[PDB]
Design a protein around this ligand. Structure first.
Ligand SMILES: Cc1cc2nc3c(=O)[nH]c(=O)nc-3n(C[C@H](O)[C@H](O)[C@H](O)COP(=O)(O)O)c2cc1C
Length: 138
């Protein structure tokens, strides 16, 4: 499996590691990839796309790297299963509600409720691990 993410201070990156740990604990292999080093072709061969990005300016996906990546794969992911996650600060998850609506709009099947955690996943560590375990069972 593969987890692709963008993180500006390390919050979403930490979530990604924790989600990977859950998948591994369930007996499966998984690689975490920063959006900068992702290979679209190899990524498109995955049965489930696990994508994460923190909330950026005015509740949007990160603009210089993550958004363009989503746009590029947008026409080639109809029917694919996706699990979404990310860290946020002062908002209430608007960027994620929009990210979920967008992926659905591209024809994807959002398999679980998106996992969102405020700032660093300190108290929410187990929640991240459990999300990974749910994904491993799909
Ligand atoms: C430029 C900028 C804009 C932000 N905009 C939002 C926002 O609109 N809503 C929100 O809840 N958090 C916002 N945040 C806070 C981040 O989503 C939050 O700090 C998160 O934990 C960052 O995770 P990361 O280290 O994975 O990037 C913003 C942060 C930055 C740096």
């Amino acid at each position: 499996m593969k987890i692709v993410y963008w993180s500006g201070t390390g919050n979403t990156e930490k979530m990604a590691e924790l989600i990977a740990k859950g998948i591994i604990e369930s007996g499966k292999d998984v690689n975490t990839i920063n959006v900068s080093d992702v290979n679209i072709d190899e990524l498109l061969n995955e049965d489930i796309l696990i994508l994460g990005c923190s909330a950026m300016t005015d509740e949007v996906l990160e603009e210089s790297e993550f958004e363009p990546f989503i746009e590029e794969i947008s026409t080639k992911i109809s029917g694919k299963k996706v699990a979404l996650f990310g860290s946020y600060g002062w908002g209430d998850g608007k960027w994620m509600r929009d990210f979920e609506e967008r992926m659905n709009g591209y024809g994807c099947v959002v398999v679980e409720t998106p996992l969102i955690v405020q700032n660093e996943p300190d108290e929410a560590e187990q929640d991240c691990i459990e999300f990974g375990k749910k994904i491993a069972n799909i």
